């Protein structure tokens, strides 16, 4: 007996102020958070249908540790396209995740957020190359316009599913 | 790329007047058809979620032939619990399906319809034994009360999934 | 920020064979279970809308009390509301309701626990517990009574939704 | 520009105690009301899909037991005429509810469905065939319902919407 | 007995041509109206889920009066970010609403529409200060791109809910 | 007896690389495909509600030929706003459709895709005039941002419905 929808534990990581919370609140509440209130730790749930399968996303929004990294099945690694340092930090978030999961192949999506802003310092091609080198998808997002937001979370679920088979 | 929901081709068979159409219309329109208008052939579609999977049911409602039996992925074999003859006919519907599919193991559910009526002539235990001998589920239904209607169709989808 | 739907932890209790599992599987899978496979402990989830509010039901399906357990009290202590199920053709299951209710009051350490009384198997002709008797019992406890059939689906949604409504009243 | 779903104004009428409220609450809340609390006037809304069309049912639940009566009957687009299958008198009253509706709508052809409620109860006094003949003589559908078991409940309301749609074409 | 979903009566006001109709049609039909057909009065309904609660939005789309303002529970005050005059008019729409509701505290959201256009004449900071002075939310929208559209309406519903408690 | 939702057979046509596949996958999977994998032929289904009517979209995604054009009830004619040649080709796609349907009045929507790109070579007004000359709607889309994607498909369904009455 099927006992209820499949649950997926997703974790959003990345440097302070890249828009991890804004992405998540946009997904859950269809609301853009304009204020910058730094996060300690928040969790959110949403039921969605992805590729014809109903599921429950349990999303942990982190601060810019080993316990959440151990329980998470997939990770959104978020940088801001106008902050080169946030992009350089991605490497370290990814190594930390691989270390705590004790694995080379953890479901992950690279997210370049704030793509609505004119002040771009990270080229799409650079981020795409970085993602290709990790063998993971790259998505450009804006929590403000909602560009790529659903896609980033759904793509992560699809990565988790590929990794379970 | 997933191209849209899974489709299941379901066929409802059994003797004239057992309630094949009424079952189907109850599923699709939430409507009990009181009149008896014999069917030639009708098809119906419905999108439902079963065990967390979205699917598109394509349901062929038959008359009390080889082409529909060949394209169908699963069969509801319907008799009426107040008509012993309709129950005896099940064996023949099942052989015909096995012959046309050239298969011993075709997804199938045995459906005893009109369970709301007081004139029962087929015992549940007899129908359960028949179903057990075929290795298929048995469900009692009423197109009038809606008892078992969803369950019969959803169980058939689950049988199709096991067989894939 | 609202962080996602409200969750309600429901526990289904009552004597062995009254239809606790059948009720739950009928809710979750729209399927009537004809076989009797005794439960140790099983849990289920379902998202529903009740009174315009989306919620997530976490349902714990328990065993008939046969004997002592410290593990029993722990799982029962997680419930916010309880369906107390008897079978309308089994007078003993109805008499046991009192003991299920005392067990719940003891483990929740409370006199006022959201609860619904469920008389299952109402499709059967062999009725031994009258509707009026069960209604009077429920009235004496100050809780709703619902007659159900896991087979026909009569009252099944209503029993679970009514329990959610009781939980909501108790939170306000 | 389509401006949002189609709205249908439905009115439930019939003798005191036939189950008008219980039918409506069963539709709206999936809840059977066991108590008998007489209604003055209540309205309820529900969005449903019927034959692939999304609509908003605005349902007026009336009293069995008078300027207010004419107003609801005038705004209503379709009527469920409910009797209880164990109460012959409620069945005899149906004719008069139908005439009252025709009078208040000032029309001979009002979308209507005949509903025989309490079909779960053993003490049936109105035969199905009698009710079917009455409905046939009016040219309207007949549905047997139980607010307790939910038998026919959706069907009664959906069938009324289908009647309203036929009457608008 | 709960009688069906909660209903919210919303009114969209603001100067001629700011995009009141376009916002509303985008919400209801997922359609961008490119033509400018001036409105007399139109009403629209939509059922949505906001913060886990199902509700029925009844939306009155107004022309560039006391009766609609009296029955409305919340107001979207819309200006266009490329039209300074529409922004200056907001003050008058707000005073008119306060006068007709006989209230200092009416649920309201300030909407800066046409944020897809390059020809911006109202600074975000100015609009944010105006909204802060009124104690109401500010949202930038585009009926064309759909940026902020759901958020503007849902935020107004959230304001109405806060005001009912 | 209504036998289940209305089905609409939609065909997406236009020059190689304009984003026909990306538009369709964005509609079906909420996913932007960044790679360019040329299509031979693919079909997709989706149930949606448009103007209160539930329907089943059967969408044929074509390559940059008589059989699909004969079974299709409506056509999205897609060009890319940074590719003038794709825009000039529209005329020929439209003639090919009229020829195979043997009809002067085939439901059709003109779609200007890639409207997120800065390298615009086709003016919106030119495309609108072309659409006006055909008596069909014009919609600007981005498969990347999702701007106009639902609108393009829904508008085509509305065109199909007008043509059936
Ligand atoms: N323009 C624009 N602003 C954004 C975007 N995402 C976030 N912001 C803004 O960036 C600021 C920081 O956003 P926030 O979500 O708090 O970032 P964070 O990554 O969660 N910070 P922390 O790790 O401290 O919790 C906010 O003021 C927010 O409005 C975006 O996509 N576009
Ligand atoms: N009481 C009751 N009557 C039923 C039920 N199912 C069907 N009927 C009645 O049985 C009669 C025949 O039903 P119908 O659906 O036409 O049966 P069918 O198998 O499709 N006949 P055919 O093979 O001629 O198409 C109808 O008068 C119908 O109302 C049921 O479950 N209970
Ligand atoms: N006729 C009828 N039979 C039912 C109903 N509900 C349950 N049953 C039957 O009663 C038997 C016991 O049901 P089950 O759900 O396993 O009972 P349970 O309370 O979970 N037993 P346990 O406490 O051992 O887990 C099964 O054969 C089942 O089909 C009902 O409403 N009607
Ligand atoms: N068994 C059974 N009882 C029903 C059904 N419908 C209503 N009842 C019961 O009959 C009584 C009357 O129901 P109610 O819905 O209040 O009737 P009404 O037509 O709305 N009365 P009024 O006209 O005074 O508002 C209640 O006790 C109710 O539980 C039904 O289908 N079955
Ligand atoms: N670029 C862009 N154009 C817009 C936007 N919103 C509206 N428009 C355009 O602005 C014009 C006026 O829009 P309309 O919705 O009719 O505005 P309105 O406030 O309802 N006018 P009125 O008060 O006369 O009824 C239309 O041409 C429309 O396409 C937007 O967000 N972006
Ligand atoms: N920036 C942007 N790129 C897009 C958009 N739509 C498609 N593309 C890009 O353009 C390329 C071609 O898209 P694709 O859908 O394969 O084009 P097509 O019309 O189906 N090509 P074919 O006819 O060979 O099948 C891909 O690289 C894709 O990412 C869009 O709206 N914006
Ligand atoms: N629902 C509360 C829990 C808290 O901890 C969580 C940890 C992870 Cl990795 C994901 C979701 C979570 O949700
Ligand atoms: N949708 C039209 C088709 C026609 O033929 C069908 C064949 C089967 Cl087995 C099932 C459903 C069918 O429906
Ligand atoms: N007279 C016919 C009998 C009974 O019913 C039958 C049904 C089928 Cl599908 C085939 C053979 C049969 O044999
Ligand atoms: N003698 C009857 C027994 C007493 O103890 C019981 C305890 C429970 Cl929780 C339930 C039923 C019981 O039945
Ligand atoms: N929704 C407010 C209305 C007012 O009066 C009503 C009249 C009818 Cl026929 C139906 C529903 C009603 O409720
Ligand atoms: N549903 C029709 C009504 C007409 O008048 C309205 C008045 C307001 Cl404030 C809001 C919505 C409206 O819509
Ligand atoms: N700015 C000059 C006018 C003054 O009066 C106004 C009143 C309203 Cl409600 C709207 C716009 C107005 O603008
Ligand atoms: N169901 C598969 C079909 C194949 O041919 C199709 C033709 C059209 Cl115009 C649309 C969708 C199609 O999908
Ligand atoms: N640019 C001229 C070519 C000619 O042949 C074509 C055929 C089609 Cl279906 C569309 C565009 C074409 O473009
Ligand atoms: Mg944060
Ligand atoms: Mg038939
Ligand atoms: Mg059990
Ligand atoms: Mg009443
Ligand atoms: Mg307007
Ligand atoms: Mg392609």
DSSP B47-81: EEEETTEEEEEEEEEE---HHHHHH-SEEEEEEET
CATH fold label, C1-172: Rossmann fold (3.40.50)
Ligand 2 atom 29: residue of nearest CA: B34
**Lookup: tokens for E103:** 């209230």
Please state whether A133 falls in left (phi above 0), alpha (psi between -120 and 50) or beta.
alpha
Partners of E30 on chain F (C-beta within 8 Å) are 150-151, 154
Find all residues with CB under 8 Å of D112, minimum gap 6, and list them: D78, D79, D80, D81, D98, D101, D138, D140, D160, D163
Residues with CB under 6 A from ligand 15: F 89, 92-93, 96
Q: Which two tokens stand for residue E4?
A: 């069906």
Q: Output the CA–CA distances (angstroms, integers) from residue E156 to B124, E51, E72, in the order listed.
A: 58, 13, 12
- Phi, then psi, of C131 in degrees rounded to 5: -50, -40
> How far does the centroid of ligand 15 lie from the alpha carbon of residue F89, in Å?
6
Q: CB–CB of E154 and A32 under 8 A?
A: no
**In the numeric block, which tokens belong to residue B93?**
């519907």
Q: Among partner residues C6, C51, C54, which is closest to E49 by beta-carbon distance? A: C54
Which helix (H) or strand (E) segment holds residue A132: the answer is helix A124-134
CB contact under 8 A, F3 and B47: no
Measuring from atom 16 of ligand 6, which residue has the nearest CA?
F36
Q: What angle do CA A17, A22, A27 make, to 5 degrees?
A: 150
Three-state DSSP state, D34: coil
Mutation choice for ligand 15 from F85, F90, F95, F96, CB with most ligand atoms inside 8 A: F96
Q: Which chain D residue's Cα is nearest to E4?
A: D45
Q: Are E125 and E156 in contact (CB under 8 A)?
A: no
- The residues with which D112 forms a beta bridge, in sequence order, are D79
Residues 6+ apart with CB under 8 A from D1: E25, E28, E29, E42
Give yes or no for A126 touching C (CB within 8 A). no
Location of structure tokens 């990345």: A14
Q: Is F3 near chain A, with CB under 8 Å?
A: no
Chain A contact for B1, CB < 8 A? no
The CA distance from F163 to the nearest CA of chain E, in Å, is 19
Q: Please, which residues bridge with residue C107 across strands? A: none
* Alpha helix positions (H), chain D: 20-29, 67-75, 88-105, 128-138, 153-167
E52 at C interface, C-beta within 8 A: yes
Between CA A18 and CA A83 the distance in angstroms is 8
Tell which residue, A23, A59, A25, has the closest CA to residue A44.
A59
Q: Which atom of ligand 7 is nearest to the CA of A73?
A: 9
Alpha helices in F32-119 (DSSP H): 66-71, 84-101
Please indicate whether, in this complex, the C-beta atoms of F53 and D55 are within 8 angstroms of each other. no
Question: Please, what CATH class does the domain formed by E1-165 belong to?
Answer: alpha beta
- Beta-bridged to residue D8, according to DSSP, are D57
Chain A neighbors of E150, CB-CB under 8 A: 30
Using alpha carbons, list the distances in angstroms from residue D6 to A70, A79, A152, D166.
51, 46, 36, 14
Could you say which architecture CATH assigns to the domain D1-169?
3-Layer(aba) Sandwich (3.40)
Q: How far is CA A35 from the centre of its chain?
A: 20
> In this complex, do A4 and C46 lie within 8 Å of one another by their Cβ atoms?
yes
CA distance E25 to E57: 13
CA distances from A7 to A12, A55, D64 (A): 16, 6, 50
The structure was resolved experimentally with X-ray
* Resolution (Å) of this entry: 2.1
Q: Identify from D2, D50, D52 which residue to disrupt to test chain F contact, counting F C-beta atoms within 10 A and taking the largest count.
A: D52
Distance CA F127, CA F107 (A): 17
Angle in degrees, CA D152, D153, D159, rounded to 5: 80
Q: What sign for the dihedral angle of Cα F68, F70, F76, F77?
A: positive
State the Cα–Cα distance between residues B114 and B122, nearest whole angstrom: 11
CA of B101 from ligand 2 middle (Å) equals 27
Q: Is D149 on the interface with C (CB under 8 A)?
A: yes
Chain A contact for B54 (CB, 8 A cutoff): yes
**Residue whose C-alpha is closest to residue C18's, from C102, C128, C108:** C128
Contact F49 D51 (CB under 8 A): no
Task: With beta carbons under 8 A apart, name residues in chain F contacting D48.
Answer: none
Taking alpha carbons only, the member of D30, E146, A61, E157 closest to residue C4 is: A61
Q: Candidates B13, B92, B95, B100: which one to mutate for ligand 9, based on the most atoms within 8 Å of Cβ?
A: B92
Assign a CATH topology to domain B1-164.
Rossmann fold (3.40.50)
* B157 DSSP β-pair partners: none
3-state helix, strand, coil in chain F (%, to 5): 35, 25, 35
Report CA(C13)–ligand 7 centroid distance (Å): 29
**Does A124 contact ligand 7 (Cβ within 6 A)?**
no
> How many helices (H) does chain B have, and how many strands (E)?
5, 6
Rounded (5°) CA angle A118-A120-A122? 165
Tokens 């609202």 belong to which residue? C2
Residue F112: in which H helix or E strand, if any? strand F108-113
Query: CB E54 to CB C52 under 8 A?
Result: yes
What residue has token string 């949604």? C157
* D133, two tokens: 């003949």
Q: How far apart are CA B20 and CA B63, in angstroms?
A: 9
Give the ligand with the smallest distance to the CA of D37.
4
Closest to A141 measured CA to CA, from A158, A159, A122, A157: A122
Q: Which residues of C touch A43 (CB under 8 A)?
A: 3
Q: Residue D158 and residue B34: Cβ atoms within 8 Å?
A: no
Q: Helix C70-77 crosses helix C91-108 at what angle (to 10 degrees)?
A: 80
Exposure class string for E84-93: b at 16+ Cβ within 10 A, else e: eebbebbeeb
Nearest C-alpha of chain C: how many angstroms from D164? 27
Q: Do C55 and E52 touch (CB under 8 A)?
A: yes
């Amino acid at each position: 007996y099927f006992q209820g929808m499949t649950e997926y534990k997703l974790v959003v990581v990345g440097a302070g102020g890249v828009g991890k919370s804004a992405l998540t609140i946009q997904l859950i509440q269809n609301h853009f958070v304009d204020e910058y209130d730094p996060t300690i730790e928040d969790s959110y749930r949403k039921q969605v249908v992805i590729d014809g399968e109903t599921c429950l996303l349990d999303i942990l929004d982190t601060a810019g540790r080993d316990q959440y990294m151990r329980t998470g099945e997939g990770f959104l690694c978020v940088f801001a396209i106008n902050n080169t340092k946030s992009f350089e930090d991605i490497h370290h978030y990814r190594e930390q995740i691989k270390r705590v999961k004790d694995s080379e192949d953890v479901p992950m999506v690279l997210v370049g957020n704030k793509c609505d802003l004119p002040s771009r310092t990270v080229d799409t091609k650079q981020a795409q190359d970085l993602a290709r080198s990790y063998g993971i998808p790259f998505i450009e997002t804006s929590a403000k316009t909602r560009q790529g937001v659903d896609d980033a979370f759904y793509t992560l679920v699809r990565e988790i599913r590929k990794h379970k088979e």
